[PDB]
């Protein structure tokens, strides 16, 4: 297969950067 090599890459790119958001907020709340 060759089309999935594009779709899965798009999906991981989507899923990553949402990982960034909670960690970014969590470090803020933690010191609070």
């Amino acid at each position: 297969d060759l089309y999935s090599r594009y779709k899965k890459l798009q999906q991981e790119l989507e899923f990553l950067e949402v990982q960034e958001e909670y960690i970014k907020d969590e470090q803020k709340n933690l010191k609070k």
Partner: protein, 317 residues
């Protein structure tokens, strides 16, 4: 024949009966675990835990001798436990429709009408579990029974049974009767009415009904009703994805904690199976930052519904 095709394919009572036959003939189980637990019970919580747990093992197997031979031990339970116990019978005879009304009528003490009204109040609930979708005439029967409005225990059990047995139909009469049952503003009727209404109004996104039911929730003294309707106002809204956004943008704006809690269930149920980026983003964000622990629970609780098509993802977060 094309005439009987309607029943063969659209009734599908044949399929229900066939599943029943499969489960009854191929019943494999071993009660020895239950007996091993039987002496460990020392309190009402454990007692009810056992009497619910065993029913899971016997789904539709119509097997209940474990109750008959432990009847006097079971008589140790009291109050709401009895409501639960008779309710569990409906699980043991799930399906089994052809005689069901008579079957429970064999044990329903309807002529006695015990001062321990639970003994009947749960029976209607059991009758709902049997007819989880094949309500039909049973629906109207339960509706007629609610016209007695005898006492709020039976009112609770009846609203549960009818709401389950008529789910998703959007039958107008049940919507009417549940409306008038909610407006009583009573702390044990109104939440059960709310739930049953959510059941029968399933997925309708019915705008006027929503505007109706949010009104009482905006202003009531009794928390129980809010703690019930928080589910119903999500359940009516299933799957419409962005069409529901206007509701969401209101609920997450509320200051009352119970409605903020409900917003989570609503955004969960709106986006089931699809990991929409804004849904995950907001649902995860609110868990990190809300002040009330119950909504912080329900927030992360909601993720499973919106992820379940891709199990390999969840451990990453």
């Amino acid at each position: 024949d094309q005439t009987l095709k309607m029943i063969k394919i659209l009734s599908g009572e044949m399929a229900i009966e066939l599943h029943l036959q499969f489960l009854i003939r191929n019943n494999n189980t071993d009660l020895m675990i239950l007996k091993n637990t039987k002496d460990a019970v020392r309190n009402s919580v454990c007692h009810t835990a056992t009497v619910i747990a065993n029913s899971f093992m016997h789904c539709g197997t119509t097997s209940d001798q474990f109750l008959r031979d432990n009847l006097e031990w079971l008589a140790r339970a009291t109050n709401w436990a009895k409501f639960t116990a008779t309710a569990s019978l409906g699980v043991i005879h799930k399906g089994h429709e052809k005689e069901a009304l008579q079957l429970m009528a064999t044990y329903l003490p309807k002529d006695t009408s015990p001062g321990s009204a639970y003994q009947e109040g749960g029976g209607l609930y059991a009758l709902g579990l049997i007819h989880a979708n094949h309500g039909g005439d049973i629906i109207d029967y339960l509706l007629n029974q609610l016209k007695n409005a005898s006492n709020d225990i039976v009112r609770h059990g009846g609203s549960l049974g009818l709401g389950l047995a008529a789910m998703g139909t959007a039958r107008q009469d049940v919507y009417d009767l549940l409306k008038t049952n909610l407006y009583q503003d009573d702390a044990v009727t109104g939440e059960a009415a709310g739930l049953a209404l959510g059941l029968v109004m399933l997925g309708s996104k019915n705008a006027q009904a929503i505007e109706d039911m949010v009104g009482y929730a905006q202003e009531t003294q009794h928390e129980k009703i809010l703690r019930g309707l928080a589910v119903g106002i999500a359940l009516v809204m299933y799957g419409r994805m962005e069409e529901a956004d206007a509701l969401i943008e209101s609920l997450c704006r509320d200051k009352d904690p119970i409605l903020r809690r409900s917003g989570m269930y609503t955004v969960a149920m709106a986006y089931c199976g699809s990991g929409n980026n804004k849904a995950i983003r907001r649902l995860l964000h609110v868990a990190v930052s809300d002040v009330n622990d119950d909504v912080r629970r329900a927030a992360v609780e909601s993720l499973g519904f919106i992820l379940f098509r891709t199990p390999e993802q969840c451990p990453s977060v």
